[PDB]
Structures are given as C-alpha cells and as structure tokens.
Design a protein around this ligand. Structure first.
Ligand SMILES: [Mg+2]
Ligand SMILES: [Mg+2]
Ligand SMILES: [Mg+2]
Ligand SMILES: [Mg+2]
Ligand SMILES: [Mg+2]
Ligand SMILES: [Mg+2]
Lengths: 367, 367
DNA sequence: AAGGGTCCTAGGACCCT
DNA sequence: AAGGGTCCTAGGACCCT
C-alpha cells in the first residue's frame, strides 16, 4: 500500500524560459506579459513588489524599470514543458502532467529496486537530499523513512539532470501521495526540495490558512464552504459529513474531506500525448461582426501546424466565444475526407459561429 | 476502399429463445410479455394478427389462444446474445453488436484470403448463397461481384454454424457498408439471406417509404424533416444542404444526407465486453415514498451478481427515475474501498434519490 | 408500468502560467 | 482583452427486444 511519490515544480517557468534564450534579461527584473496581465515574473522582480497575475499597470508602479516580454504564444513554453516530462519519463515512465510546469512521478518501484541492491552496511548510511519538512527527525529503522529518503535522492538526481540537460531549475517534493507531495514541494520555493515524513502530515495540512490552498478545492467550492462557516482545514475535518453531502454532493464532499486529512489514494496517471490542442485570443469587445473569420483563420493555421507535427489525427472540432457582460461553445465531428485543408474547416466553424470578447478553437478526440 | 460487410439479424429473438427451452411452445402462437407490452412474437402469431410491440389487450383480441411467457428478466436473452457474437468472432474478430440480436462483421480481409486460395478455374465457378437483391444479374468478371458473392458464402456458413451450434435461425445481409448490409438483410425476413450488388443500391434505398426506415433517422429527426416537407428518401437527397445544416446541425445534416444516398463509411467496430450494466423496473405510479429502497435493492443484487461474473470492476454508479406526467438521473463515482458490499451502495443511491413510474441502476466506466 | 444498449453534446469543476 | 490543460455531469440522440 505504501507509495513514494514526487512532485516537480519549475521556478517561474515562463520567465525562466525567457531568461534562458536571452541571458541579457537575467539579474534584471522580468515579467512575462499577456495583454494587461503580468502572468509571472522572475525573483529579481518579486523582491521589488511584482506579483504573479498582476496588472501591467500596478506592476510597473511597484517597479517601473521592469523589463517585460510578451508570452502570449505558448509554443516555446509548451515545447520545453514536454522536454521536462520526457526527461522524467526516463527515470520512471509513469509521469502525470499538471499544467505546463508540474509533473508527478511514482517512485515506488524505483525506490524498492535501489533498496535490494544495498547491503545492511550502507542502509544505516542512507542520507537525505534536501530539506526534511518540519526539521523532523529521521529513524533509519522506520522502513517508510528509508524509502522516502531514497525518494529524495532520486528527486535530487532528476532536478540535477533537468539543470544539466535543459538548464532549468525547480523544486521537488517527496511524500506518500500526490496531495502531500505537491503541498510539501513548495515549502522551500526557490530551487530546493523537501521530503515529508509521515509523522508530520498533520503539521503540513494545518499549516495552511484557507481551504482554497488544498488542490481540489477551488473558487466555487471554497465559497460554498465559507457560506457554511468552514474556513480552516480543521473546520472541514470536523464538519458534518451528511451536511456536506447534502450541500455539495457525495463525490465532492467525501473526497475533499479526505483531502483535509492529507488522504489521497489517486494513482499517478501517465499523461502521455495531449488529449486536445487549442488556441485562444482575447480582445476588448472587438469582434462585432462576422469578418471575425480572420481571427479564426489565425487559430486554425497554428493548430493545423501543431497537429501535423503531432502525427495523430483529430475527429472533433470546437469553437468557443465570450460575450460582453460565462462561455458558450459549439462542436461537431470532422468530415472524414478532411482528415486526410484550411478552406473547408473555416466554413464549418462559421456555421458554428452563426449558431451563436474571446474566440478559441480546439481539436480533440484524437487517433 | 472496397469493403464486404455482413449484418446478422436473428428471427423473433426472445420468442425463438423461449421456443427453444420449451419445445412445447413451438407450432403454437407465442408472444413474449413485458408488463402490458407484447414485445415480440413468433411467426405462428404474426400470421394470426399479433404484431411486435403490441398491447397485451389488442393482441389477445386478434389471438385469444395466444400463449404468453414473461420476458422481463433478460438474463437468458443476454447470455444467448453473447453466445452469438462470440461464435461470429471466431470467423473474424471484428464484430460490432447492435442491440441483443444484431451483429456486423467486416468480411473484407476474409473474402480476399479465400480468393488467393482459388484458381482461375474455380473463380468462374463462384456461386451465390441465398438471394440476390432485385434478382440482379451477376457478372463473374466484376471483381466487386465476386467478392460480395464470397461474402454471401461466409454469411451462409455463419448462419449454419449458428443453427448447428446454438439452434438459432436468423437472416444475413451482405453489402459494401453497414447501412446497406442492414437494409438488405431484411428483404427476406424469415431465416434467409440476401446479397446487394452495387448496381442495385438505389433500388434498395428508394424502396423505402419513410425516412424513419433509415438507420440513423429516428423520431425527433424524422418529425423535424416532415415539418420541412421531406417525406421520401429522394426528398432528402435533393433537399438543400444549407437549410438542412441550419435546422438540424452540421453533423446530423451531412451524415443523414449521405445515408440517403446509401453512403456510409463508418467502420465495423469491435464491441467487445459491455461498457455498462443496468437493470430497470417500471410500475404504475407505485413508488410514492422513500421505502422504494426495496425496489432499488433488487436492482443492485442482480447487477452486483452480473458484475462479479464479468470480473471487471466499475467506478461509477447512476440512478434513474421517471415521474408521473422525460427522465432524470444522478450519478457519482464508486468509493475505492467498496470496489474490493450491498449495504454501503444502497445509502449512496438514496442520497442520489433524495436529490430528486420507473427506477433504474447502472454500473459504467469499467476497468 | 419494456428493458435494455451505444455515443455525443454543452457546460461545469478543477489544475497550472 | 491570459492562455492554456484535465475529467466529470445530465441529458440527448440513435439502435434493438
Ligand atoms: Mg508550478
Ligand atoms: Mg511553478
Ligand atoms: Mg486549491
Ligand atoms: Mg433485429
Ligand atoms: Mg431480429
Ligand atoms: Mg431509422
């Protein structure tokens, strides 16, 4: 039953990429811009007040010397994201992606192979790589302690390999399930790693200050929980299961309540190739007429290219819109003759358009 | 591109099963009863006026000597259904199920292997098994004619095997795609087979009298088409694509219009093991109070048994209801500890019940 | 008061930058 | 005026007996 999981989280991902291809930006405070949004920034800029997901106005206020690069085309970030996952797949092939910069790996089978190859002499010599959460004391006779420490050594090899092979830095967290691995990897956020021994599981979850910090609990779920007087991890631990079921559902209630105890039995899933390809564009209630084709035609040309590179073929298309005030969408299957180019697709999408501040296209259901 | 497909359709399936396990019912007119509904009947009863899906009142009127057996528990029909599919899977493993009594098989690879094993001498000796649709003339030099005729010989071997091994009779239709195979298999409905040569494709589709007879066109679609003045296959062939798209959708319009020409490029899919297990019960606004557990508990006990036999494990449950006047449903995932029994499930379902003339349970999303 | 099946759709929730 | 991802839900359509 006992598992050793690792969670790898790159530091200021987009910014770290821009700082790589243009070393001239290192040491200088950097923000990565998407329209009016500074979506992330390096640490030279966080010190100066800039914060993730900050207005381009407020950010230049706290740092007028802030150098900004446009990060709207994710192509380069996506390509590097998959270079990271692919390298980790060398260690163990079961690698789950979370967004572009986070990866889960189940190290269990790999920890146990390393253990058989050791002797009674070197086992007492097993050491930790990186921080132990809560400065908790190690017990070389606790077999769970030994396995987690081996997990931290693997985690350090990955992080070094990532830097040696892709010049990227990041954090790692080693724990017994995915929830705790992710929560502990950020205890030392700047290019460091942390291992969570079981006896500190409760210190970790109770170190949080709002239930939203639990991966699995978002805006709607949080707000519903505070409309019930649930503001802390412990409030949710002790809240009535029944009342929780008959207010949020039997699936939401019974899993988030297990997350509040640090429990999470979900396996690390192999993300493999993507299940979808999409592109978005946003605009200040600009598209006011059907000549919004050009904006659509742009999105296809990049998707069609990305698909051709992927080699697989999609069988469903989707169009999304956002309307000046909540999103609406229409999809349909892809004609067969088309699957084996640009002109016909457009006319499908506009038929979808006419059935109905943002336009987006997606290719899903891939073979 | 050229395919040889076969469609196998058993004669009065439920009735033929009841006549097997009780030979005493053969020769006598038989209906299979589900509540007030005579869902099917043998041919000794169709002659006497009884019709598929007929009131138990009107049927006994046209035939008071009608012997009826209850067919509400489908267990036996389902078990025989899969004995049929499994036997056909011996011929070629790619077998698509349609309901309990119909099966599609792609005979293409099997037709071509048989052809290489022949000599120029026996090829002119190739003969048809069963009817040729529209008494059309065979051309032993048309390679498509030869392949379809080989398809009819395989179809005859299946039907014989089905009778020799399971004592079941049925019809087969051999054509170049799934739509036409299904349409031609019923031209001689009582334990016979028919092959459709390409030059008669249009005689077959135009032999239909309402667009509803096209597999793919149902109640809602038919009615929408008649609200537009489309009553015949040809009306739909000639109807405006645009008007069809902007009234039914780009997926519905552009495929049903291809079905009206006898075109259908969908492949024969391997149905394999089921994707769901469900049980239903109906009742004259009977369940009026929460003690409807007993009716639910019945459905679980049979599903739980069927699942245990299957060996796979489900990960989602669903509850369906119908309310005296349109169905409503609630589902959720299956707790993990449960997956590896009866008491806990009930309390999930009732929570689903309280969130909300028929009750039903389903196990889906199987591993 | 049938008793089952299949697959799709539009929208929702969650996770990142 | 971010720009992407994942998976689930309730209901719909279609096909049989
Ligand atoms: Mg991250
Ligand atoms: Mg990060
Ligand atoms: Mg959260
Ligand atoms: Mg049939
Ligand atoms: Mg039949
Ligand atoms: Mg039809």
């Amino acid at each position: 039953s006992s598992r050793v999981i690792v969670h790898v989280d790159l530091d200021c991902f987009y910014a770290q990429v821009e700082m790589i291809s243009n070393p001239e930006l290192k040491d200088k405070p950097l923000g990565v811009q998407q329209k009016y949004l500074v979506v992330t920034c390096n640490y030279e800029a966080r010190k100066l007040g800039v914060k993730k997901l900050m207005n381009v106005r407020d950010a230049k206020e706290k740092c007028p010397q802030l150098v900004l690069v446009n990060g709207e085309d994710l192509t380069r970030y996506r390509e590097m994201s998959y270079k990271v996952t692919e390298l980790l797949e060398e260690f163990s092939p079961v690698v789950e992606r979370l967004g572009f910069d986070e990866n889960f790996v189940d190290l269990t089978e790999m920890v146990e192979k390393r253990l058989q190859q050791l002797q009674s002499d070197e086992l007492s010599a097993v050491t930790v790589s990186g921080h132990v959460y809560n400065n908790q004391s190690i017990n070389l006779l606790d077999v769970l302690h030994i396995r987690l420490l081996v997990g931290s050594q693997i985690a350090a090899e990955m992080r070094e390999a990532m830097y040696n092979q892709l010049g990227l830095t990041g954090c790692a967290g080693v724990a017994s399930n995915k929830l705790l691995a992710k929560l502990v990897s950020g205890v030392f956020k700047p290019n460091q790693q942390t291992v969570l021994l079981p006896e500190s599981c409760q210190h970790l979850i109770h170190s949080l200050n709002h239930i939203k910090e639990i991966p699995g609990i978002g805006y709607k779920t949080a707000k519903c929980l505070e409309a019930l007087g649930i503001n802390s991890v412990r409030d949710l631990q002790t809240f009535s299961p029944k009342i929780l079921e008959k207010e949020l559902g039997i699936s939401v209630a019974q899993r988030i309540q297990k997350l509040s105890f640090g429990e999470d039995n979900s396996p690390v899933i192999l993300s493999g190739p993507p299940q979808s390809f999409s592109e978005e564009d946003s605009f200040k209630k600009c598209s006011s007429e059907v000549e919004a084709k050009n904006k659509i035609e742009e999105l296809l040309a990049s998707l069609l290219n990305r698909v051709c590179q992927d080699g697989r073929k999609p069988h469903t298309v989707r169009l999304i819109i956002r309307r000046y005030s909540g999103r609406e969408s229409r999809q349909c299957p892809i004609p067969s003759h088309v699957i084996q180019v640009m002109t016909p697709m457009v006319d499908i999408l506009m038929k979808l358009f006419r059935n109905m501040t943002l336009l987006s296209v997606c290719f899903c259901n891939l073979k």
